Amino acid sequence: VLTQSPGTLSLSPGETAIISCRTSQYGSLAWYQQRPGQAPRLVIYSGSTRAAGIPDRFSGSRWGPDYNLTISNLESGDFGVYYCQQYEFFGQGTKVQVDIKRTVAAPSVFIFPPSDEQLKSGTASVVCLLNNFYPREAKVQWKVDNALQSGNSQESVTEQDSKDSTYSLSSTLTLSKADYEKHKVYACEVTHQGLSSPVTKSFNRGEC
Amino acid sequence: VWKDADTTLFCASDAKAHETEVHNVWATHACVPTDPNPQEIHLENVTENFNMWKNNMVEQMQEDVISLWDQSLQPCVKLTGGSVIKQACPKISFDPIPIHYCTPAGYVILKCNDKNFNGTGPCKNVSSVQCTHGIKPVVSTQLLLNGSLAEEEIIIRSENLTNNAKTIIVHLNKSVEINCTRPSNDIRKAYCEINGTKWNKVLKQVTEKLKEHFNNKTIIFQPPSGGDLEITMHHFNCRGEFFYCNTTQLFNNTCIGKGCNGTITLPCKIKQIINMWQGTGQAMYAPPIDGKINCVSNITGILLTRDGGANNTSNETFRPGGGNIKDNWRSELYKYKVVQIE
Amino acid sequence: QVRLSQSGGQMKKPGDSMRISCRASGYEFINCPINWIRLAPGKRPEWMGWMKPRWGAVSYARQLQGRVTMTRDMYSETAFLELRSLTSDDTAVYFCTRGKYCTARDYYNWDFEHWGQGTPVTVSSASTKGPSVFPLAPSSKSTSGGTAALGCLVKDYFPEPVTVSWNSGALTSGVHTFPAVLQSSGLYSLSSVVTVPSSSLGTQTYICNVNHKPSNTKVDKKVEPKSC
Ligand SMILES: *[C@@H]1O[C@H](CO)[C@@H](O)[C@H](O)[C@H]1NC(C)=O
Ligand SMILES: *[C@@H]1O[C@H](CO)[C@@H](O)[C@H](O)[C@H]1NC(C)=O
Ligand SMILES: *[C@@H]1O[C@H](CO)[C@@H](O)[C@H](O)[C@H]1NC(C)=O
Ligand SMILES: *[C@@H]1O[C@H](CO)[C@@H](O)[C@H](O)[C@H]1NC(C)=O
Ligand SMILES: *[C@@H]1O[C@H](CO)[C@@H](O)[C@H](O)[C@H]1NC(C)=O
Ligand SMILES: *[C@@H]1O[C@H](CO)[C@@H](O)[C@H](O)[C@H]1NC(C)=O
Ligand SMILES: *[C@@H]1O[C@H](CO)[C@@H](O)[C@H](O)[C@H]1NC(C)=O
Ligand SMILES: *[C@@H]1O[C@H](CO)[C@@H](O)[C@H](O)[C@H]1NC(C)=O
Ligand SMILES: *[C@@H]1O[C@H](CO)[C@@H](O)[C@H](O)[C@H]1NC(C)=O
Ligand SMILES: *[C@@H]1O[C@H](CO)[C@@H](O)[C@H](O)[C@H]1NC(C)=O
């Protein structure tokens, strides 16, 4: 009923955050900010009305069912997670986090087949690594015998590196041993701005 | 020309000077006699907006009924805010009379006569009256008693149905009697009788109306989720005594979707220690009077709340509501609003 | 000035019940409903229900019907929350809230200007389970002109956290230990990786040292190229 997007914004101070929320029903929509380790705060209510204490850099707008919170000239105190709300219903949230700008860097992509030690257990984990890339935005898709995979994968991302300002991501495809021994080609496909084309790293089960 | 406005209304009634009954005594000093030949003017080509949920007439009637009760139903002991007030508490004659509210000079009451008018929005048939109809200041929860019926269909009323915090008033078009009795010779134990055939047919009609407002979802009734006894039970005053009746049987989902065709009897009890609806604390009264205590009332409305939450099921659940006695006056004052002439 | 103060955080086991309090001040307590909202990391905020102080009238969220009870004390102007049959999913920070607009005559419940400071609650088993550690092996041929990636997969442990060092902390450059993910089984897993020169694969020994204080587990694992 309330669909907030995007999940994450990675921005520098001074830039503008644009956070949207689509509702399936018109009514008074409110926006909340939750700073780290602090209680949520009313930012906007009734779509565009600013709560007391909220500077005019925050502004709410609406186009049809789409409500937007735009935060201009981002300051330190603006980062955190934002939520849209309608009655008792809330959006999934939008995490606005500090990003330090650097040149684009394509990820170094590696894939790791399941250990033979793990295959004795009955489960198979295939790991794909995306190393030292920028910007944060990246997509990883798993393919097993050229079939797109959904719901059997989990990702994890590092904090932006203090030194080289890059990110690194790890995706894990998880299959039963039986299911794993059914197929041959295991591949993960990485799309990222630094790549002129999506890059696929793959291995064929059984052969070294 | 006129405009919406708020002013100090006055009261009219047919209170008897010889009557020792409480509502009569109050209205004698607070109100004027009624007009034998009232004047109603139907307005053609006139469309007005109404809002029963923002009608300050309700506020003034509330003040009155509070004043009436404070100056009449004095407890033996009044427990409020940490202190104790021990007064005299003789038994009283208690039977609500009709009360008319009227506008002073320069003002007038607009009345909405759309037969299917739901409480808010525009009205086509607008008439101009000086006073409202006679409204009995019946204080109760869950069920509206002795009120006026809806002319045509059963009307659903809410400030906003999509807001689960807003009370729903169900306005019936056919009344169902509720016959409450404390027999002679446990003195505090009592009961209410309701015709199961008539009620369940009405209740079924109610769910059918509710379907029209909730996308043909399954309409389920449930007992109150919690709160004080005054709201988790059908609370009302009959002949001075404070009744608490259990309405679980009244909202039998089985009977609205065989065998419940019979007499519904609700378990009630007369409590001497009550929570004051005027909004203070607890009040203690004398034990009930001897002999048969009996009140037969018209159930003319129902107070409901609707369940909410981040669910996804295709059934809406409703529970008996009330507690905000202002809503009681809203249900009778819904078709009126005050306007000032120029 | 409107204030809502909540009781302190607590920890619970699955199956327990919990009660928390919210003391209100700075306004006429009976005029407005008090709400309970819980925030868990990576989940939508969840409205649990409201309570109107006048009669203690309550409205519980459908999915919590039966497990939750909201009460109030009029004198101490304190609202109370109770949640029974706790499980892992109940782990969250619990807030009481009240609407911005509240007069003696009217209110709007849902614009939550006023929040209590929050009451963190953790529900978890007292049981611990040490990690399984599997090597993430480099590659087949040693490309003497590039760098290789290796690491170890630290799977199925409970609870948090585990730490990973390489070669007893001697190897730090190029190391990436990822934040753990919570698996469907209710157990955690993470990976630690490091990039090294490919030319050093038949010379240098690489060992990941996994530490899991709750299960009192320290395990070293040697990550070497597969032989075929
Ligand atoms: C219902 O609520 C919305 C906002 O939630 C408000 O704009 C609208 O005026 C309300 N409707 C009525 C009839 O009060
Ligand atoms: C208004 O009055 C006219 C004239 O009797 C009637 O036909 C019409 O049904 C009325 N409108 C409503 C909404 O009741
Ligand atoms: C009452 O009628 C108005 C005007 O048509 C409409 O906007 C509102 O939703 C209705 N309310 C109910 C409870 O049916
Ligand atoms: C109850 O309803 C009947 C008809 O339904 C009516 O004649 C009677 O006057 C009503 N009693 C009241 C309003 O007290
Ligand atoms: C009351 O209204 C319902 C529709 O809500 C209708 O089916 C029924 O016939 C009405 N009863 C009357 C007018 O006596
Ligand atoms: C109400 O019920 C009593 C028995 O409980 C019965 O004697 C009496 O006749 C009933 N009154 C009416 C008006 O039906
Ligand atoms: C209930 O009301 C019906 C009329 O709708 C009547 O025929 C029946 O006798 C009543 N039941 C009892 C037990 O009096
Ligand atoms: C009402 O009566 C039913 C009958 O079993 C009982 O279960 C319920 O607890 C009662 N409710 C109250 C509020 O006393
Ligand atoms: C509803 O009616 C059925 C059949 O008469 C009965 O068994 C059941 O107890 C009723 N539910 C109540 C009284 O809550
Ligand atoms: C409803 O009105 C009748 C008289 O018409 C009276 O006997 C009965 O007690 C009233 N009910 C209440 C709850 O006041």
Coordinates of N, CA and C in Angstrom, one line a residue, chain B residues 5-11 30 56-57 59-61 63-64 101-109 130 338-339:
Chain B
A5 N -21.9 29.6 11.3 CA -21.4 30.3 12.5 C -21.8 29.5 13.8
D6 N -21.2 30.0 14.9 CA -21.5 29.3 16.2 C -22.0 30.4 17.2
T7 N -23.0 30.1 17.9 CA -23.5 31.0 18.9 C -24.1 30.2 20.1
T8 N -24.5 31.0 21.1 CA -25.1 30.4 22.3 C -26.6 30.1 22.1
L9 N -26.9 28.8 21.9 CA -28.2 28.3 21.7 C -29.0 28.4 23.0
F10 N -30.3 28.3 22.9 CA -31.1 28.1 24.1 C -32.0 26.8 24.0
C11 N -32.5 26.3 25.1 CA -33.1 25.0 25.2 C -34.7 25.2 25.3
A30 N -33.6 25.6 32.9 CA -32.6 25.8 31.9 C -33.3 26.1 30.5
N56 N -20.6 22.4 16.4 CA -20.5 22.9 17.8 C -21.8 22.9 18.6
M57 N -22.9 22.6 17.9 CA -24.1 22.3 18.6 C -23.9 21.2 19.6
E59 N -21.2 20.4 21.1 CA -20.4 20.8 22.2 C -21.3 21.4 23.3
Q60 N -22.3 22.2 22.9 CA -23.2 22.8 23.9 C -24.1 21.8 24.5
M61 N -24.7 20.9 23.8 CA -25.5 19.8 24.4 C -24.8 19.0 25.4
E63 N -22.2 20.0 27.2 CA -22.1 20.8 28.4 C -23.4 20.7 29.3
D64 N -24.5 20.7 28.6 CA -25.8 20.7 29.3 C -26.0 19.3 30.0
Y101 N -33.0 22.2 20.8 CA -32.1 23.3 20.8 C -32.4 24.3 19.7
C102 N -32.4 25.5 20.0 CA -32.9 26.6 19.2 C -31.9 27.8 19.1
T103 N -32.0 28.5 18.0 CA -31.2 29.7 17.8 C -31.8 31.0 18.2
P104 N -31.0 31.9 18.7 CA -31.4 33.3 19.1 C -31.7 34.1 17.9
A105 N -31.9 35.4 18.1 CA -32.2 36.3 17.0 C -30.9 36.5 16.1
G106 N -31.1 36.7 14.8 CA -30.0 36.9 13.9 C -29.4 35.5 13.4
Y107 N -29.8 34.5 14.1 CA -29.3 33.1 13.7 C -30.5 32.2 13.3
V108 N -30.2 31.1 12.7 CA -31.2 30.1 12.3 C -30.6 28.8 12.0
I109 N -31.3 27.7 12.2 CA -30.8 26.4 12.0 C -31.2 25.9 10.6
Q130 N -36.3 26.9 13.4 CA -35.8 27.7 14.6 C -35.2 26.7 15.6
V338 N -25.8 25.6 12.5 CA -26.1 27.0 12.8 C -25.6 27.9 11.7
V339 N -26.4 28.9 11.3 CA -26.0 29.9 10.4 C -26.5 31.3 10.9

